[PDB]
């Protein structure tokens, strides 16, 4: 087995930023993240695999291609040279932000120090300054990788919604509409709603029945469809929408909300489970 | 799927058994619109929450219910401030309009119901606050107070609220309901059982249903495919076997203090419940023809005192030993 | 680790002292979906918590024993900070509301209504159990919230509360639970468990009678007997003889000395000395109910007292235990019991 | 929409002529109105005896149309701390009257729920602004009122309603609802009321609801007892006879059979037996002491809950034991 990759911020700022976007999202969701270092792609998974006293059920499954990495030499004894690896997200955030600060030369990562470690090496010029980092990781086995499977979603009630891009006339407007739910301190369970189109965020309280809507023209990727979710999931959704041009919002009637984000490819899907039954 | 108590909770007023008085009054109120303020009281597991939920459903339907009902129970704060603000605000609220479907399918009387379950846990200050809130808004809001102990409800609120006493569910009262539940869950019971279940569960159908479910689970785990006997029911209901009780009686008869002390030590090592053995001793002694009237008077007062002391969360060992020693000197 | 924890049965098949209770637990755990609310009541130290954990392992599989402890903060009416420790594993929760005093109602409301409403969907929905140790210590206000909490939110949460002498548990709570009686082991089973422990621990044993002595001296208390076994194992260089003394806790010895003094010298100055001893006992957080119980059952073991004195002692003990239940200061009732005993003995 | 209301707040008197029972209080307040002088009143009595009805009818009679801006009514449902008394009550009873003239009214319903600080503040408001404002204090418990507050108020005591007042109100309600009532049902209702009219109206509403056709069928004592769930007098007499005369086993069997025939409660039987025994002429005097003490203990224990069979046998044993002194 051997793991090494070559990532340069300058050659492709977009995919490097997509990589940093992912690291932060998986850090914000919870600690640790599974790095399914397949020989031909990388999938970064942050799953509860559940919750007892917190409510953590959100699962993010980001797929990034191998072509994003300049060099993606990955070999092992598993099928199609699969290395799955769990590492604390704080250290990976620190490594990536340090490399970004230095860039603001290539970044070299090799699997070098059960409990293994990774090695991040890159050079800074002000003069020659070398920056070496070692994040403690764990060599997860194939058996533990088998039980990590993305949630299959039905298509009998999963209506899709093509949200307007972040850049353009509607970019700031839709961002404001998404974030308008964040200006109240009693909003924990938002209630999405879709009528066949309009996107209504409904807040239920004894004070006053708030009914935020979206009057702008909205399209569908292709009947009511209402899903109650927590507010942290919506914060993650807004952060995803901020850095994603193409975003798909899929709703399962009284079930779950699927936030599909693409970068034409590096794709991000956020699985959100209903908090309350309507 | 679910525990049989929550699975077989009545959904309409027809399913509620043995409480005919209150249920007919409420059913007649269905076709009228002058529902009073109701005070539901009775022993535990007698069908009060079931009755109020069934009535509220029959009144409003699943849709209007969420907008025309406010429920407060002991799991939420119900202080004087809460009673003065939240309950008064809900009573002040105008009656939400019904929809077309609600207007045609359900009766939808022109008022809202405030259900205060576990009202015996409210301080007298909160009830005093509730007095005029109940009164001055009687044309727009109806109040339901549910409790086990009426004496915890202050006299003004007991006067304002119409009183609906729920009878204890004996064998005769709830035998049909227990048979219904047993047959629908495919429970094979020997004759005599389903009456022992209701005799052990004195005035409590929740306890009887849970006992039946536990007996069914045992008989299913056995895989033997035989009926449930009364002995099994008494075993898993916490009833002391007749032989142990007979030994207790015989050691009391020979009034030696040390023998009784040693036997009580071993018996309390056996983990029995002092209330249950005290009850069984009551049955044995008061129904026995071998004792005279004077002995029965003294034993009745001793058992009453022991039961009252045990109801106060005292030490079961000390109370039982004192009771048995007192009986030995009678 | 202690021998009580080192040899704790981690499975429903590893429990080897009651059998019939194990059969009932297996019957309950065959179909976990329709599991009711349970109430385990029996003498202290018999193994009720072990039975609960074995049932939880039977239902949710191994992993219920991976306990994570976290401190969660509360606020009372007077806005003071309270810190309850919640021993939380996956698939179940442990709460000891008695860690707070009369302020356990806010815990039983906030912490438990939080999880009762919060569902456990992750499309599949499971019910997460909650264990309430020492259900007797609830103050009739936590139980009133408890009853509706578990009646209405049964679909998402299940309650398994352990207790001994469930008389201070209110009728609505008892009616809402399946009553599981856990009797204490006989001396033979305690001796067998101790034999297995010493065999796995390589302690040299002279004779098997010194295990029956431990079992009899522990009064059907598995944990107490195992702690005695470890004590005489580490105080005799891992070689136990019939000369090895039966060791009892310090407060038990103090109570026996107090009994001897009360029987011997009966005056107001003796009453004051007894008050000093009782204050020393209360300074060690020994609950007054068990202080009175041990005092009574040590005074009833004195052979110099006739039947009249013993009957008077038990009557006064019952009266003052009821007084202690409804009281606020324990010293009044302890001193009253001792004074009545000293006045009746002479 | 007065047909959409419970019978209690549907037959609430609107005029002073409709408040029955309290002849003397009504006559005196009518004289106070006629003479033009109204003192600071204090209405005290049991619940449901006509205090709020009387004060509201009196205020309506004094200010027929200006009632909204002439009367300030406060009750336990409104906060009445030191600040409320200092600000709201003082500012109301410190400003000139509306329309031509008059005196302002401040009704304090359930004033025993007020703290001592609020009453201590209120006393000087009462004594200082009495020229143009009069107070009415309504209270069920007079021990919660400061002695100064009681001093500066004119006391009117509302007795529990007599038989005649309840009979007249029952006749009015029967005429209004086209209901019938047997004389035995009238007696049963009188006895269960215990000087309360709200109880009468609630029981009558439940009796109308019980009847299959409330336009043809009457209400007998059987319907009264079935709906209210109380023991018939015959049942109480039979239980007491079995306890006093028969042996222990048959007395216990009779108690259980009588209880299970109609699902009677033991507390109702205890109260009925106490009412029956209060007429008994006991000859040992220690028979009464034992009865009263034991039955009060049993009633208290019942109130706290517990074993019903144990409590019933305790009742039987307490009665038989006490009546042992009678023959002595
Ligand atoms: N009359 C009845 N008919 C049918 N089921 C009943 C009846 N009384 C009780 N039950 C059953 O008893 C269980 C709980 O009864 P509830 O009425 O909800 O509780 P409860 O009467 O309020 O007792 P509390 O709340 O402890 S005072 C449910 O499973 C009901 O089905
Ligand atoms: N003298 C009376 N004449 C006619 N109806 C009466 C009389 N007294 C009471 N009532 C009835 O009892 C109902 C409520 O009694 P109220 O007088 O309003 O209450 P209350 O007398 O103030 O008792 P409290 O102290 O407030 S609980 C009224 O709506 C009437 O129907
Ligand atoms: N069947 C058994 N076999 C071996 N040890 C047991 C058994 N049952 C209980 N024990 C031991 O008893 C000790 C204390 O029991 P515990 O579960 O604490 O009782 P309780 O639930 O009354 O507190 C535990 O450390 C456990 O090892
Ligand atoms: Mg209830
Ligand atoms: Mg009033």
What does this protein look like?
This is part of a larger assembly, with chains A (278 residues), B (330 residues), C (346 residues) and D (328 residues). Chain A is α+β, with helices and mostly antiparallel strands. In chain A, 22% of the residues lie in helices and 36% in strands. In chain A, the strands form 2 sheets. In chain A, strands 5-1-7-8-9-6-2-3-4-17-16-15-10 form a 13-stranded antiparallel sheet, covered by helices on one side. In chain B, β3, α6 and β4 form a beta-alpha-beta unit. Chain B starts with a helix and ends with a helix. Chain B contains 16 helices and 6 strands. In chain B, 57% of the residues lie in helices and 9% in strands. Chain B has 3 domains: 169 residues, no CATH class; 70 residues, no CATH class; 91 residues, no CATH class. By secondary structure, chain C is an alpha/beta fold. Chain C has 14 helices and 9 strands. Chain C is globular, with a radius of gyration of 23 Å. In chain D, α11 packs antiparallel against α12. Chain D is 56% helix and 7% strand. Chain D has 328 residues and is α/β, with parallel strands linked by helices. Chain D contains 15 helices and 5 strands. The chains are: A alpha+beta (278), B alpha/beta (330), C alpha/beta (346), D alpha/beta (328). Chains in contact: A-C, B-C, B-D. Chains B and C meet through α1, α10, α13 and α16 of B and α2, α5, α6, β7 and α12 of C. The site of one magnesium ion (MG) has 4 residues of chain D, from α2. Chain C: Keywords: ATP-binding, Cell cycle, DNA replication, DNA-binding, Nucleotide-binding, Nucleus. Chain C: One of its GO terms (biological process) is leading strand elongation. Chain C: This is Replication factor C subunit 5. Chain C: It comes from Saccharomyces cerevisiae (strain ATCC 204508 / S288c) (Baker's yeast). Chain C: GO terms for molecular function: ATP binding; ATP hydrolysis activity; DNA binding.
Largest sheet properties of chain B: 5 strands, parallel
Number of alpha- plus pi-helical segments of chain C: 14
Helix content of chain C: 40-55%
Strand order of the largest sheet of chain C: 2-3-4-5-6-1-7
The rounded Rg of chain C comes to 23 Å
Summed up, the domain count of chain C is 3
| Greatest contact between two chains | B-D, 68 and 61 residues
InterPro entries (chain C): AAA+_ATPase, DNA_pol3_clamp-load_cplx_C, DNA_Rep/Repair_Clamp_Loader, P-loop_NTPase
Binding site for ATP (chain C): 4, 16, 42-50, 223
Protein name (chain C): Replication factor C subunit 5
Main location (chain C): nucleus
